[PDB]
Design a protein around this ligand. Structure first.
Ligand code: HEM
Ligand SMILES: COc1ccc(-c2cnnn2-c2ccc(-c3csc(C)n3)cc2)cc1
Length: 456
């Protein structure tokens, strides 16, 4: 099927047999999407092994795929590798089964239900401050990945199951051990193989091989059973078991798999984005000072932030949004075409993966002035409405966007406020001023960001 885009009159790199264009992934997903956009223009296609992938960049065409024709045509993402019982997760559920899961879990992420999570989240904001002050009063350079990763674990554990632990200073607890335990290696030899060898995916399903290590899942599967046995609470687990008794209902095996991806998504993202924010704040002290001035103005005398005060901080929203533009951790948005459909004057055949290159759009000079720079002023209210909502898609769009968007934004902002209320961050020895992105399948820096923490 290597002649598809040739017959459709769609440009793209010439694919090799059995490999497609995966050899061009040697500079990471980010660099490959940039070069193809510059060479082939608005629309191009390539191959991940035998799988044809059509990249679209027209905002009207993006809206049709992600919003207008989401339920009818572009409903599911590309099939993942061996998942086992995790096939019931909402992030990989398909068609009607996903629609049931999305509706059953939508009330869990309401703005009203998010308010009640602020007191628990803010509880570990001060825990993070104490962990930073112990490393700041000693003048030790701080790897943000460890402290922010510790903070994100504390928020996820308490918000999901109510478990209250200082993961940074309790790495030996049985709960933190399994949750941290995970293979963190999309361009790893495994995921590169299943691209060339998608036929081997059902092989590993019957072998009971899962991308999730079976030790962690069995611990989490058994742990949730004990918590349900114990069953006021306002955490994710209660909010889902409450929906069980409340359109069909959620099974206790679905409930476990549903909550696992919340930890999956909540843990790695939050910490990674927070480190990306702090690198920019360290390399741009003027933004950090202006953000610190705003944080102190809304919250005098280092006042504890609440749900309402965070949403008032406009520059904090600008700082978060601009960092997400420079570093869209998804790097891509994908939908599988379910049928022969003509959209925006173009024929997309069945089974093709339609891809939206979020990274290549976020740095396209056509839509962003000096895209390679860090300019929070792009998202000021004066310049805010000139941004097309289908070019800047940090959390996706349409019915299948990031369901935990508001929680994640609240969690990171509550973290930034408490940290910036008490500390200022400056570059250190190994700051790596030209921050290099990892050439792998994950949007992370080549080397972990290390900075100096000074007590105000
Ligand atoms: C920095 C934080 C985060 C970012 C930048 C982010 C971004 C994204 C993106 C780009 C998608 C794909 C949407 C698309 O295909 O159109 C997504 C999906 C998703 N995210 Fe997040 N996300 C974040 C945090 C979280 C958290 C903390 C949770 C936990 C509840 C979460 C849960 C999900 C789920 C469940 C999906 C799948 C949606 C579906 O298939 O129905 N995300 N996220
Ligand atoms: C490990 O680095 C990441 C973790 C989570 C996310 C993330 C953000 N928003 N969603 N999300 C996500 C991604 C994949 C799954 C997944 C893979 S396999 C399975 C059953 N679920 C679930 C959630 C992004 C990067």
């Amino acid at each position: 099927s290597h002649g598809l885009f040739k017959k459709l009159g769609i440009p793209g790199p010439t694919p090799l047999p059995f490999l497609g264009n995966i050899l061009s992934y040697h500079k990471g997903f980010c660099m490959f999407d940039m070069e193809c956009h510059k060479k082939y223009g608005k629309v191009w296609g390539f191959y991940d092994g035998q799988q044809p992938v059509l990249a679209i960049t027209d905002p009207d065409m993006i809206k049709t795929v992600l919003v207008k024709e989401c339920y009818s045509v572009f409903t599911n993402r590309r099939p993942f590798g061996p998942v086992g019982f995790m096939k019931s997760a909402i992030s990989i559920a398909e068609d009607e089964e996903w629609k049931r899961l999305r509706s059953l879990l939508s009330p869990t992420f309401t703005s009203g239900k998010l308010k009640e999570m602020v007191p628990i989240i803010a509880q570990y904001g001060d825990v993070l401050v104490r962990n930073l002050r112990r490393e700041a009063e000693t003048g030790k350079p701080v790897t943000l990945k460890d402290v922010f990763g510790a903070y994100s674990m504390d928020v996820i554990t308490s918000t999901s199951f109510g478990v209250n632990i200082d993961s940074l200073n309790n790495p030996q607890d049985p709960f933190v051990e399994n949750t941290k335990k995970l293979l963190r290696f999309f361009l790893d030899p495994f995921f590169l193989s299943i691209t060339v060898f998608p036929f081997l995916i059902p092989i590993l399903e019957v072998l009971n091989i899962c991308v999730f290590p079976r030790e962690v899942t069995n611990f989490l599967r058994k742990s949730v059973k004990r918590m349900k046995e114990s069953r006021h609470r306002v955490d994710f687990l209660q909010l889902m078991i409450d929906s069980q008794n409340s359109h069909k209902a959620l099974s206790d095996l679905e409930l476990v798999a549903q909550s696992i991806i919340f930890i999956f998504a909540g843990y790695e993202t939050t910490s990674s984005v927070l480190s990306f924010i702090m690198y920019e704040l360290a390399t741009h002290p003027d933004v950090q000072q202006k953000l610190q001035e705003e944080i102190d103005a809304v919250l005098p005398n280092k006042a504890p932030p609440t749900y309402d005060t965070v949403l008032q901080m406009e520059y904090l929203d600008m700082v978060v949004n601009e960092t997400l533009r420079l570093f869209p951790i998804a790097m891509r948005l994908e939908r599988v075409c379910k049928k022969d459909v003509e959209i925006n004057g173009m024929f997309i055949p069945k089974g093709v993966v339609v891809m939206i290159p979020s990274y290549a759009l976020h740095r396209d000079p056509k839509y962003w002035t000096e895209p390679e720079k860090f300019l929070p002023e792009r998202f000021s209210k004066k310049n805010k409405d000139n941004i097309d909502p289908y070019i800047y898609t940090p959390f996706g769009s349409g019915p299948r966007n990031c369901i935990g968007m508001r929680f994640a934004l609240m969690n990171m902002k509550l973290a930034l406020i408490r940290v910036l209320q008490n500390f200022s961050f400056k570059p250190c020895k190994e700051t790596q001023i030209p921050l290099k992105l990892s050439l792998g399948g994950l949007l992370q820096p080549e080397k972990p960001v290390v900075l100096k923490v000074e007590s105000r």
